[PDB]
Amino acid sequence: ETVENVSKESERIWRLQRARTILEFEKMLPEWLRSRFRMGELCKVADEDFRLCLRINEVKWTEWKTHVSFLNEDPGPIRR
Amino acid sequence: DGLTPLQLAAKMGKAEILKYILSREIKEKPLRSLSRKFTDWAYGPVSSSLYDLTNVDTTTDNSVLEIIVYNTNIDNRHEMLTLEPLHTLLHTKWKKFAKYMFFLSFCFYFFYN
Amino acid sequence: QGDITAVLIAAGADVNAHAKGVFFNPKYQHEGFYFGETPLALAACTNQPEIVQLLMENEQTDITSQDSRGNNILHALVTVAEDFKTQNDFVKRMYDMILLRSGNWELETMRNNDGLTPLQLAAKMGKAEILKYILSREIKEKPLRSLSRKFTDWAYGPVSSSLYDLTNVDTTTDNSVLEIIVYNTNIDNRHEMLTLEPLHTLLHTKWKKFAKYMFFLSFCFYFFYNITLTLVSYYRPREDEDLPHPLALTHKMSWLQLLGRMFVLIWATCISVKEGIAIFLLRPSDLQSILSDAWFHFVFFVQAVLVILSVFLYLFAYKEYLACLVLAMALGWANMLYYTRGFQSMGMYSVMIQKVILHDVLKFLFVYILFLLGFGVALASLIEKCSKDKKDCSSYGSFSDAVLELFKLTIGLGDLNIQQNSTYPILFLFLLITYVILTFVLLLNMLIALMGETVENVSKESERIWRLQRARTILEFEKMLPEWLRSRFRMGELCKVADEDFRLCLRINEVKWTEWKTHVSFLNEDPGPIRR
Amino acid sequence: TRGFQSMGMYSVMIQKVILHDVLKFLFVYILFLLGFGVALASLIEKCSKDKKDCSSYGSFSDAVLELFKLTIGLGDLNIQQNSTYPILFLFLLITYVILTFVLLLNMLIALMG
Structure with missing residues (x-):
């Protein structure tokens, strides 16, 4: 199963050995971390809109449920 | 040991229960202040999701990626590291910080030899 | 909300509205979700089949209205259905439902702003599964079967002769389907x-009648072209003085070389004519296909032009009489690999060569030089500071000489720098055997780089590339002789539906057992090859 | 070689490979053998010394054999008795030696699938 396991475990070791150096290059320059990105602490629940820093991902088809869970009035990349 | 439960799931590395804590959608609104995922758009097939990122990134002491990778x-x-609030976040800094710092460590070390 | 929808339509809400907002997003996979701007397509795209049937009972509803992109509705359903089979397949079901609820033929003829039919749009974006529906499309009725694309002719149990319909498919008009797909x-x-049936047999048709007979003539003409270039270096009168003429004019008898030397220079013009067109057409093809195909048209052009450029150099005498010829002559026997198309047996062994040079040889090469440069410096600094052969080394490249004495052990060696060395010269057989084994693991591990479902994927992807690289040349040999296309075959426009029997040109295929249905769909009175 | 089920399997696959893959190997291998040979045979006398010491046999084909035996067994003096920067004579062998090897390694995959 070198056909199977070895060319899969090489994926297992390589993504880790990349991931070690990236966290090392965070800790290598503690000078000016101005380009850490955080989406700028949008609203969570309450009147406390400035709450905690977030991130963004996107989804696709398969089981079109209805919707009351959202936050906004179907906007886009709302820059204004 | 001074550990949050999210830290305890990482430090012992019990992976499947950590898939639940970082996802955690709660499809209500008397108590959805405990969630860790947020859906923003409601537009049929496309939808922009918001993961929550409190102790995950290395912004405080003893964060999640510091526990996992080291x-x-x-x-x-x-x-x-297949799991989504970690998989894209490593990929984030490889676009903006690490890869541009990486080849400078190569090209400096290359002329050294 | 179909229940709220009923009151809104009863109140008189407009159903032919548009929407031209910022939410189109040409960077499609975010913030977008294209419609086709109409309320009908939004009902269609998002699986509201009750509402799609609801929106067509209203007489005020238009269908033929277009988009800002020019799209009608059946353009839009094509631009949504992605490459995933049976995702509770609804686009194939609902593209069906819009035509059968209403429509004459005047829906699939309208062009977009890019000037494309919906059949062309499915090909140009390459969304394959919905194109399987359009080219099949059997309609087992007869009030409305003038929209079909397949026709069954015989009704004879297991055997049945089918007729595909072939309107815009073959390259008989401008911007046809195969021209879109293959190029x-x-x-x-x-x-x-190209597995799909009204394309799979049609490529196979011209390889029986046009291309394969034209193909080996392009081989046998190009084959003798390289022997004639070869026979100025063999040159059976073995030596005369020093040969001051590579490609001469030979004012002398035995016209076999007079026809011979002129046979090279004529074909250098034809490749110069034909592959000078490669700039005029292939402006995005080369940089996008950086590792795939269509590069040999450059490499034929590098070869044949340098044959003439030696002959221009022969009259201006920059000393490169023989120099420009030979180090460009070698491509002439190397470019023969273009003709390795032609056998399915030969094609598989042809593709995988260029597979490995791009994948794994350069992966092999960067590490192999890194150890070759590695252990060489330890031995090159060994060769003179200590380790005798004291005075006997005054020949060449005191670093690089030791590299070659470490380089040839890969290939062929067995020499005296072991026997003519010092500083305990068994040490000189430590710092080779660290190299010899460490080549071998870096050589053995390249086998594993040709593993990893190479059993599965590689001998399947070689089928994927080979059928395409045949299919490019066949459509090129259509466009190569526009002289007399009398042997394009079409079955001669048999009856479609109406009193218009001479209707449109067709084709023929045949079927087999499994689910003996009954038959009212046919055309004739169970005939055979009815010649009469 | 019929007679053992053990011996029979090794007997059939010989005639399998001569019909399938050796002739697939052979047509390409000669195509490079004829390929790099002409560049070296036209090298052997017009430039690149061993000036007078070449009056033996087949000025084209002699260079072919000096490129043919590297597949089998060689190590000879037409490197050491050459000119026109004779390291170049170890470029236009190593283009051949590697390009045999991929055409030899890929025959393993022709005995895969």
């Missing part, structure tokens, strides 16, 4:  | 489309 002693470690 | 870049499931 650790020994666990064996399913690559099966944890 | 295109930018798509990745391209071989999964």
Whole structure:
């Protein structure tokens, strides 16, 4: 199963050995971390809109449920 | 040991329960202040999701990625970095910080030899 | 909300509205979700089949209205259905439902702003599964079967002769389907489309009647072209003085070389004519296909022009009489690999060569030089500071000489720098055997780089590339002789539906057992090859 | 070689490969053998010394054999008795030696699938 396991475990070791150096290059320059990105602490629940820093991902088809869970009035990349 | 439960799931590396804590959608609104995922758009097939990122990134002491990657002693470690609030975040800094710093460490060390 | 929808339509809400907002997003996979701007397509795209049937009972509803992009509705359903089979397949079901609820033929003829039929749009974006529906489309009725694309002719149990319909498919008009499919870049499931039946046999048709007989003539003409270039270096009168003429004019008898030396220079013009067109057409093809195909048209052009450029150099005498010829002559026998198309047996062994040079040889090469440079410096600094052969080394390259004495052990060696050395010269057989084994693991591990479902994927992807690289040349040999296309075959426009029997040109295929249905769909009175 | 089920399997696959893959190997291998040979045979006398010491046999084909035996067994003096920067004579062998090897390694995959 070198056909199977070895060319899969090489994926297992390589993504880790990349991931070690990236966290090392965070800790290598503690000078000016101005380009850490955080989406700028949008609203969570309450009147406390400035709450905690977030991130963004996107989804696709398969089981079109209805919707009351959202936050906004179907906007886009709302820059204004 | 001074550990949050999210930290305890990482430090022992029990992966499947950590898939639940970082996802955690709660489809209500008397108590959805406990969630960790947020859906923003409601537009049929496309929808922009918001993961929550409190202790995850290395912004405080003893964060999640600091626990996961530097650790020994666990064996399913690559099966944890598939998980979405970690998989794209490593990919984030490889676009903006690391890869541009990486080849400078190559090209400096290349002329050294 | 279909229940709220009923009151809104009863109140008189406009149903032919548009929407031209910022939410189109040409960077499609975020913030977008294209419609086709109409309320009808939004009902269609998002699986509201009750509402799609609801929106067509209203007489005020238009269908033929277009988009800002020019799209009608059946353009839009094509631009949504992605490459995933049976995702509770609804686009194939609902593209069906819009035509059968209403429509004459005047829906599939309208062009977009890019000037494309919906059949062309499915090909140019390459969304394969919905194109399987359009080219099949049997309609087992007869009030409305003038929209079909398949026709069954015989009704005779297991055997049945089918008729595909072939309107815009063959390259008989401008911008046809095969011209779109094969010449295109930018798509990745391209071989999964040429499995489909009104294309799979049609490529096979011209390889019986046009291309294969034209192909080996292009081989046998190009084959003798390289022997004639070869026979100025063999040159059976073995030596005369020093040969001051590579490609001469030979004012002398035995015209076999007079016809011979002129036979080279004529074919250098034809390749110069034909592949000078390669700039005029292939402006995005080369940089996008950086590792795939259509590069040999440059490499034929590098070869044949340098044959003439030696002959221009022979009258201006920059000393490169023989120099420009020979180090460009070698491509003439190397470019023969273009003709390795032609056998399915030969094609598989042809593709995988260029597979490994791009994948794994350069992966092999960067590490192999890194150890070759590695252990060489330890031995090159060994060769003179200590380790005798004291005075006997005054020949060449005191660093690089030791590199070659470490380089040839890969290939062929056994020499005296072991026997003519010092500083305990068994040490000189430590710092080779660290090299010899460490080549071998870096050589053995390249086998594993040709593993990893190479059993599965590689001998399947070689089928994926080979059928395409045949299919490019066949459509090129259509366009190569526009002289007399009398042997394009069409079955001669048999009856479609109406009193218009001379209707449109067709084709023939045949079927087999499994689910003996009954038959009212046919055309004739169970005939055979009815010649009469 | 009929007679053992053990011996029979090794007997059939010989005639399998001569019909399938050796002739697939042979047509390409001669195509490069004829390929790099002409560049070296036209090298051997017009430039690149061993000036007078070449009056033996087949000025084209002699260079072919000096490129043919590297597949089998060689190590000879037409490197050491050459000119026109004779390291170049170890470029236009190593283009051949590697390009045999991929055409030899890919025959393993022709015995895969």
